[PDB]
Design a protein around this ligand. Sequence first.
Ligand SMILES: [Mg+2]
Ligand SMILES: [Mg+2]
Ligand SMILES: [Mg+2]
Ligand SMILES: [Mg+2]
Ligand SMILES: [Mg+2]
Ligand SMILES: [Mg+2]
Ligand SMILES: [Mg+2]
Ligand SMILES: [Mg+2]
Ligand SMILES: [Mg+2]
Ligand SMILES: [Mg+2]
Ligand SMILES: [Mg+2]
Ligand SMILES: [Mg+2]
Ligand SMILES: [Mg+2]
Ligand SMILES: [Mg+2]
Ligand SMILES: [Mg+2]
Ligand SMILES: [Mg+2]
Ligand SMILES: [Mg+2]
Ligand SMILES: [Mg+2]
Ligand SMILES: [Mg+2]
Ligand SMILES: [Mg+2]
Ligand SMILES: [Mg+2]
Ligand SMILES: [Mg+2]
Ligand SMILES: [Mg+2]
Ligand SMILES: [Mg+2]
Ligand SMILES: [Mg+2]
Ligand SMILES: [Mg+2]
Ligand SMILES: [Mg+2]
Ligand SMILES: [Mg+2]
Ligand SMILES: [Mg+2]
Ligand SMILES: [Mg+2]
Ligand SMILES: [Mg+2]
Ligand SMILES: [Mg+2]
Ligand SMILES: [Mg+2]
Ligand SMILES: [Mg+2]
Ligand SMILES: [Mg+2]
Ligand SMILES: [Mg+2]
Ligand SMILES: [Mg+2]
Ligand SMILES: [Mg+2]
Lengths: 86, 205, 82, 80
Amino acid sequence: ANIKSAKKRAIQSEKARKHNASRRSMMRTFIKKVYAAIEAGDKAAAQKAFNEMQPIVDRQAAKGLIHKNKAARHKANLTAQINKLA
Amino acid sequence: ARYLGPKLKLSRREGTDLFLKSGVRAIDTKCKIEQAPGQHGARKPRLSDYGVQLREKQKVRRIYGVLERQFRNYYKEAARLKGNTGENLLALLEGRLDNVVYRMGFGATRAEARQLVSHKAIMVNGRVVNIASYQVSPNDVVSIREKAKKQSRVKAALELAEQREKPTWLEVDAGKMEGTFKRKPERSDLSADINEHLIVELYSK
Amino acid sequence: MVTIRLARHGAKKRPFYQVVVADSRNARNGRFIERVGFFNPIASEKEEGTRLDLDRIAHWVGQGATISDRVAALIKEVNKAA
Amino acid sequence: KIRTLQGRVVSDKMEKSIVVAIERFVKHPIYGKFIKRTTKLHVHDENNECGIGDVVEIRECRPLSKTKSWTLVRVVEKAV
RNA sequence: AAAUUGAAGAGUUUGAUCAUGGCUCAGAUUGAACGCUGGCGGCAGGCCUAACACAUGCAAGUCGAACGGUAACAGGAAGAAGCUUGCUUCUUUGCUGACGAGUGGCGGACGGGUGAGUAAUGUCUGGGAAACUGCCUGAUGGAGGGGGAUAACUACUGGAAACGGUAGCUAAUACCGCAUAACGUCGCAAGACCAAAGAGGGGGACCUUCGGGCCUCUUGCCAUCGGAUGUGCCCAGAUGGGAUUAGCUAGUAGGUGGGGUAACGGCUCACCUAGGCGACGAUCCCUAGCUGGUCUGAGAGGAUGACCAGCCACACUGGAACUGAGACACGGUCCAGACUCCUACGGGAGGCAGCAGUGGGGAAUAUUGCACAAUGGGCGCAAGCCUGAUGCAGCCAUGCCGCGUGUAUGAAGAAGGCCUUCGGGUUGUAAAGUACUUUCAGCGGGGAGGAAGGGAGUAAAGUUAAUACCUUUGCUCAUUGACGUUACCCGCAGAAGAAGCACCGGCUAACUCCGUGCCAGCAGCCGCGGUAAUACGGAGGGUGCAAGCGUUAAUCGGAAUUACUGGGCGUAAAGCGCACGCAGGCGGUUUGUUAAGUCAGAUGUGAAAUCCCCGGGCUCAACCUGGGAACUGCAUCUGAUACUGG
Ligand SMILES: [Mg+2]
Ligand SMILES: [Mg+2]
Ligand SMILES: [Mg+2]
Ligand SMILES: [Mg+2]
Ligand SMILES: [Mg+2]
Ligand SMILES: [Mg+2]
Ligand SMILES: [Mg+2]
Ligand SMILES: [Mg+2]
Ligand SMILES: [Mg+2]
Ligand SMILES: [Mg+2]
Ligand SMILES: [Mg+2]
Ligand SMILES: [Mg+2]
Ligand SMILES: [Mg+2]
Ligand SMILES: [Mg+2]
Ligand SMILES: [Mg+2]
Ligand SMILES: [Mg+2]
Ligand SMILES: [Mg+2]
Ligand SMILES: [Mg+2]
Ligand SMILES: [Mg+2]
Ligand SMILES: [Mg+2]
Ligand SMILES: [Mg+2]
Ligand SMILES: [Mg+2]
Ligand SMILES: [Mg+2]
Ligand SMILES: [Mg+2]
Ligand SMILES: [Mg+2]
Ligand SMILES: [Mg+2]
Ligand SMILES: [Mg+2]
Ligand SMILES: [Mg+2]
Ligand SMILES: [Mg+2]
Ligand SMILES: [Mg+2]
Ligand SMILES: [Mg+2]
Ligand SMILES: [Mg+2]
Ligand SMILES: [Mg+2]
Ligand SMILES: [Mg+2]
Ligand SMILES: [Mg+2]
Ligand SMILES: [Mg+2]
Ligand SMILES: [Mg+2]
Ligand SMILES: [Mg+2]
């Protein structure tokens, strides 16, 4: 970049990018564990997995990695499905 | 921006005295007043309808010392204004400062009056106005400023003025060299061998 | 945010300001929300020169609109005049 | 506050949808003659109670599909 | 009170006529150019072409009151000395006024440029419902206790440069757990789950580890529900042309369910139904940013979308996402392309449609200027710093408006020129002469306003333990203008420095002589030129404009010559060679009904500017400005039911 701060911003945005990426990848992992339990038909594994997932979709919302509404749908959606089976 | 050439030529072309000289002299002893300028002045113009309209507009312009652009703008304003356009045109002309200065007798001619104006010899309401086309309003007081008061042109100008018909709508104190534009002149105040409607016709076609 | 300020109209060497409420990001003479006064710094002061709809100015402040240094002055000046 | 349209059913083929035509007269902007104009609207018909040719009362609602932003309020006249 | 209360025709077909019909002219307008000419000023305008390519500077920073900090300069200091004993220079130490580089915060999504793309994820009008929203704002509570890092820096090392490699090492409002957790999110509920950060100013007992504790106020941080502003989304109507384009469509149209977004949605995927669009113009092709408005017109229209303002789109070309409240980012990142620059040959760097400026193209469009003083934006508690936004200045008669280039007197009316029947006429009161004025330009002298604030003190209130600090409001003192030699006023010198351009056969205001001889040439249209040419060219005279005047280009007008208002088709251009007939248009007469068309009223909206009316301010005018009227339109509701429609 040409301007002093523009240079600095590219550096900061890359750091943030690697920070966000790391936390975001983690989060989706814990979401995916729940969908995987559901697809195997286990209430407990899927409830257990939902309980681990809950606090982290909530936290990443508070931290701006995602919006509150996204966290809610995930909880709403998974909760809907797990109940529909056991 | 001003017509600077010979003046009696203009009178001679329009067929009338345009008061472009002081009036100290019978105009016929200064020029062949009843003959147009030039080699073919004796010739008569078998004059078209457009021609009579043109010459009448020229006549009025040459009386007041106004060139085409400003005069056309005067027509536009007369038209926009309420009431008869032809009469509105003459109100606007007759309200010019160079003109009013002439009518109070401060200048022997409108040309001389205009020079008085331009050369910062005239005040309006004790305020210096030096642009000729300044529109003067009812109750205004135009005066020769103190320093210009001893100019001999002005005394002579007031003498001649005293020998012209005296305009109704102006109150002039010759001693103070101040005067008051009481009201806009009516149509009836102004010469009756001006054909404004011809000028109005020229500018509507 | 929303701000109350002077949009400079008038002509060269003869400034004339229109007091306006607007999104602070829009250009000075650009998009505004509401016109609320004017300010002539060149007024003869024989008659008027500064007029403010103080009722609508306050309404906008009540909803968090900020106020120019220059409008903040006008308001104190006009409040003093009457 | 119940803004509404009235029109007739030109197609009832789709599952839970219908095509409604709203026809009106309009003054021609230049030549003054009054001209027929038609507006076709994809409308929601949950329960498919609307038959072709029916005259139906419809209202505007949120998007229901790429092309549906209207739903059925009620049938007015049917089976001419 | 006023505020669309306005409308012209001429030349040219014929021997002549009337009609038909085109061509042409008078008018307004312009971001103009060229030719001749050119004094001043105010206000405006200024690459219309190559969305061609760009050297150089500048156009986005700021905060030490988040943080470790010193390298510059500035003081200060135990202690070195300049020592001529209070003046001091340097060795030192961030002690502090500050501050390079660094982490961190907020801004680089605004401001500014362009109109390529787009006939619709556009614009305009009017409505909807499923949403987010930094800074600013109201409400109610948090702001507990910890942890591991890292740039800077240090050591070693690679590069020509750009910029790196190792290992050390350290701070925070950087970053992460843990606790706390509802008027928040999920859930029928029971329950389950989510955050944070400090930093400053001043201080009374009181005292220590002299850091501060503690007291106090300012400010920032977290949560939730609001306000305001911004933005996303959906529907309807309108918004160019072409049928020498008639059929178009597989995420296509809908349904179910999963996923997805801030949010509704074929947004996406699977499955199912077989739809959806189209002659009321789909599809395809050509062209184009839309609007307020602008120009023209009596109007209805026609033409148009510089300058100002609103929306959109773009940022070398094609594609992409990252950061962020906001971007798929105008001076950010990545990939590919086109192109250019640097190189020590191994490798690097960049994107003026920001402001100046350059090459190129063109009939044609400006200075590589001054200033943040004013308004406004970014950061900061502030002081302030930044701001080619902006305010100004330069250039160009490009346009509009104003003024000047003198005023008065001046006759047998000179000389010269021009015409003349040689009598005289004209140029012409024109010139010379005579007085007289001095705007503007020149030169000296003086001198408003655009300035509000901010800075020291002071005093009072609200604060508080407090007269501190903070903040508000009065007081005094000293101060802040790029423009600038400002506007404007006074003085000096002298008419002194300031007039050109086109036209004069008819249309069309203005006529004669000489030269030429169907030549040389003119020409908007008719038409001029072979011996008297007011038409060519010169002259004298005249007409029209005037710091301009002509020519060319260009829109509308006149053109009732695309005719809705407002025309025609026997012989002038125009009835299909004839009939049947789908779609379409139109449809006799009565009643009832409906209330879409139509009509009425009410309400909201129709941005500001512009236009118009009455006022106000610059000496006037252009110009600036207050208020109004107007926006003839759209939409919702409620009525009326004669006519049209059902
Ligand atoms: Mg779902
Ligand atoms: Mg002029
Ligand atoms: Mg003939
Ligand atoms: Mg020249
Ligand atoms: Mg200028
Ligand atoms: Mg340019
Ligand atoms: Mg620094
Ligand atoms: Mg933090
Ligand atoms: Mg917790
Ligand atoms: Mg903590
Ligand atoms: Mg779905
Ligand atoms: Mg285009
Ligand atoms: Mg511009
Ligand atoms: Mg420009
Ligand atoms: Mg614009
Ligand atoms: Mg791109
Ligand atoms: Mg994001
Ligand atoms: Mg954009
Ligand atoms: Mg650039
Ligand atoms: Mg060239
Ligand atoms: Mg003679
Ligand atoms: Mg001068
Ligand atoms: Mg001042
Ligand atoms: Mg004639
Ligand atoms: Mg000629
Ligand atoms: Mg001859
Ligand atoms: Mg033309
Ligand atoms: Mg017409
Ligand atoms: Mg006809
Ligand atoms: Mg016959
Ligand atoms: Mg025929
Ligand atoms: Mg026939
Ligand atoms: Mg009834
Ligand atoms: Mg005035
Ligand atoms: Mg106005
Ligand atoms: Mg108004
Ligand atoms: Mg308006
Ligand atoms: Mg009926």
